[PDB]
Amino acid sequence: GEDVFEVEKILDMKTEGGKVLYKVRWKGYTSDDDTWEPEIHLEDCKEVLLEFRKKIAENKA
Numbered sequence: 001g002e003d004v005f006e007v008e009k010i011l012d013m014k015t016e017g018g019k020v021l022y023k024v025r026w027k028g029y030t031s032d033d034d035t036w037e038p039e040i041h042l043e044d045c046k047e048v049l050l051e052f053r054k055k056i057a058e059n060k061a
Contacts (some may be wrong), residue, residue, distance in 0.1 A: 007045060010052035022052075 008027035011034060014058060022040035025031070042048060 007048050008044065010042065010048060010055075013052070 008025040011023040011025050013022050014036075015021070021036045022039065022042050024035050024037050024042070026033050026035070045051040
């Protein structure tokens with residue numbers, strides 16, 4: 001009941017009136033299934049966050 005779905009990775013982020021959302025790729029699903037999630041859903045996904053921060057840093061320089 002606890003692991004029905006898994007985040008593969010954060011694809012991108014946004015704010016909407018200052019509040020953070022993440023666009024999520026669900027492991028085992030296609031890009032048609034991607035969703036926007038509020039930050040509080042991902043805030044504790046440490047590895048997922050590290051990987052997204054790395055992708056930000058890499059696209060910076």
